Write a protein that binds this ligand. Structure first.
Ligand SMILES: [Mg+2]
Ligand SMILES: [Mg+2]
Ligand SMILES: [Mg+2]
Ligand SMILES: [Mg+2]
Ligand SMILES: [Mg+2]
Ligand SMILES: [Mg+2]
Ligand SMILES: [Mg+2]
Ligand SMILES: [Mg+2]
Lengths: 150, 150, 150, 150, 150, 150, 150, 150
């Protein structure tokens, strides 16, 4: 893609509901050309889709947690554990990272009780788990994963 | 909000581009009523906006990191540090968590070089930082922060 | 309950032996009404009971310890371990906490010898224990678990 | 004190509201003698007082925390910090322990918000604090500090 | 024992080769009485024996190490491990300590090679060992275990 | 020195009170030659002296501790701290070790109170101390620093 | 070897392509004598060989890592693990160290992907591995293992 | 460069003293062409130079260490510390790594004494050092930094 695509994405990452006319005027290109470029970005897998940004508080998601999960070595324990973690309701992020050489799991729940029942108790029952450390998020300074172009 | 709003949000969290007709049919309610409910959710701050989901790889964001930053105690060092972290280009998430009682910073860069120049070198220059630990994400098992209703 | 119940509890948490007359005068309500309110709090499970506060030193409880116990993952090891810990003579507090994601055990003994025989040796024999760390309390700055209303 | 005093304390630690007659019958001694012995225990500082046991949940104390606080060395930082910690509303226990060679603080709050405002923010402002680690209690297996005679 | 015994021990802890006459004069008591008191201390198990203090360097004991050894929980692993550690040639001290809740082993060897062959390789072969951490002593500021009376 | 000196030291390390005749017979050499060799070892600094081995329990030394002390970097803080540690009454061993790159301090006290007053409180007042960790020895499996020849 | 050999090695460690004449002049000795001394050093195993120093960047070796690998205790797990680590393509250094009492592995790869496929995934499949921690090298301040004479 | 250059480098990384004829025969290309390609690699900075591989033991380099050094945050402490570390005699490798987010220093000395005098004492005097951890290498399983093509 080119610089024009980047300018388009820079806008769509923040507000996908801006009419074509508005965007066409901002970047200075024919509306039909804008539409074409957008359709091409979607087809090329650049734009994966469009989502509504919902306020977690509105859904009473008050118990936010980030958990480190260490896996037992051998067989295929690591890859398997990653998959089991990602299937847990409430879990939106699962990453394997170097340094701690383990999984970092991002999740959201309405209450401590839900967290315990849906997440912790389930993870505690997984035998290939060596250790876990749950950091309770008590403050979200910033959370805009949608912003990929600064 | 009610159960109907929840069903609507459950759809919009995945695809905000579904025509009203389609959604109206799925949930079984008048199109005008659907439109009204959606407009009300936006006005009540439930739906904060609509974003395009862009594939990080398409932008060559190959260097993904999660960093723990500990702050010096006293004065207003903690709150201040949180703000400085959130302003760094590439940083999309900043949280203060219990357990490690520190900040967890999510960021994305194209290369090691960019990470060093834009993030690490900047953080290294902040005196109220006591310690930092950067975990290099080498595998994204799952990352769907948009999914708030499972 | 109401504000009056709170004022009553604020007194009973410190001294349950204050005559009804005295309390009735302090909060300014009929003695019969005070008695009724207290009886209602006990019946509603707010007031669980009344205890004598005994000075641990008077019983030569000189060896005070706080131990972190990590459990093996899988099966029902975690819940089971918690129960085994709480049954040990001398143990008055057992909590499962996030962060270290393990159990914190509060106990009191007369001497190192008793601690070893009654607590440590018993815990050491439990196979589902992964690690333990005993912090020896050498100074009790404050310990008033009875104070719930500040 | 003697064995009889111990039997008396073993009862009073659980229920201080048992009439003298009842206790007199259980331990087999004259009521007047029981009353005398109890009065003597109070005078000798063995029985410090009588408290009502209030159910924390009844007061919505849902955010329970245990925090480790490390102090800077030198001057009188350690002793001073201990005192500052014990004065924080919600804090019921403060201990200095060996091993981690730091303070362990027990506290209770109604919500995350109260915890942050009353405890964490206050501690964060104390300059002689080197590090803190807050363990969020998500399960109280046992908490009977009143039981000193097993 | 009394104050006189203490004065005698204070001398014998440093130099057991001081003639009776000399000690008798220093503490001001009959020589026969001194001899008697010393014989009594040996008989009562206070004085366990007399040793020559040999300079480790004279024996080329250049590789001094302090190792922490963690044991697996369950069965009698802990007590057993302690015994196995104490039997290793070169090991002069074995302690079980709280805090790290493990064994601390003091040993001396002539070279890295001897340390590896006699100690490390042997410990590495013990299955009930969970972890070990060997601290290499590069400086002996003080080592006078014989001094028990300051 | 030679093999004969080693055999002599192997005996003196355990019992310095064995008459010359006895040792002369065991190793098979003239008594006068034994005496000469011993005198030479003392003169050459091999045998530093002779001590009485006193049972710590006999002196009620019930509070045994091993503490790790980390020093601030810069100036001459490290060397200085080592000296301050070695001068504390009760401290018999002070070592600087690699790995943790800090000081390990061995000490003995009669009670927790003495430990606090004589050791901990003093160390807490030293500003160049960065961290300390005191391991409470609850079991002495072996402690024979006098044995240098196995 | 002597001082002259050392001067020769001091040169060869930096540049093995200096003609004999040049070296002969610098150190002031007959060329034939220089050649002889060099041949003798090679024969005595002092000079193991001559290598070309290749710039890692020229080969796109952009992913540099240093990993700590802990081994399970018992049997011959430790020695065996060391050998398995050293056989992994990309691994140039494997050391067993005290302190962490584990293996430190130095390796180089072109990309994160290669690192994952050739190193991490392979190590993850080894059952006798207890833990691993990979430090991502983001800056090579100095790397001149060839310099042995300063 | 091409595949032929790679084959040439694969040989030169192990033995830079192979005559041109030998290499020319192995890879199957004109000797003059081989010479040209090698000269081009040197000119393009691919081949930085040629070194003699000296056996560390031959120089009595028996004390091998790997040290982690943490730097204070702020100003230019980090970059500056890296430079100071790399200038220490005996230090051949200095890297800044993520995970521990600190410096890893590789060094070699003949004895503990030299290590202390040349390295440790010098580092201890640097005020911007927050912590250090020296791992003593007691076994070199593999060390072939020259091998860049496997
Ligand atoms: Mg989005
Ligand atoms: Mg979204
Ligand atoms: Mg109470
Ligand atoms: Mg009570
Ligand atoms: Mg002795
Ligand atoms: Mg001795
Ligand atoms: Mg070389
Ligand atoms: Mg080379």
């Amino acid at each position: 893609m080119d610089e024009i695509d980047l300018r388009i994405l820079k806008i769509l990452q923040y507000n996908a509901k801006y009419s074509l006319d508005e965007i066409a005027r901002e970047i200075r290109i024919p509306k039909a050309t804008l539409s074409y470029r957008i359709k091409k970005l979607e087809k090329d897998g650049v734009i994966k889709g469009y989502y509504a940004y919902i306020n977690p508080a509105s859904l009473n998601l008050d118990y936010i947690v980030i958990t480190s999960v260490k896996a037992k070595y051998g067989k295929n324990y690591h890859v398997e554990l990653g998959n089991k973690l990602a299937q847990i309701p409430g879990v939106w992020g699962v990453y394997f990272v170097l340094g701690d050489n383990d999984f970092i799991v991002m999740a959201r729940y309405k209450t401590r009780e839900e967290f315990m029942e849906k997440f912790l108790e389930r993870v505690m029952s997984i035998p290939e788990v060596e250790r876990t450390s749950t950091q309770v998020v008590v403050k979200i300074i910033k959370e805009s994963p949608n912003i990929v172009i600064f």
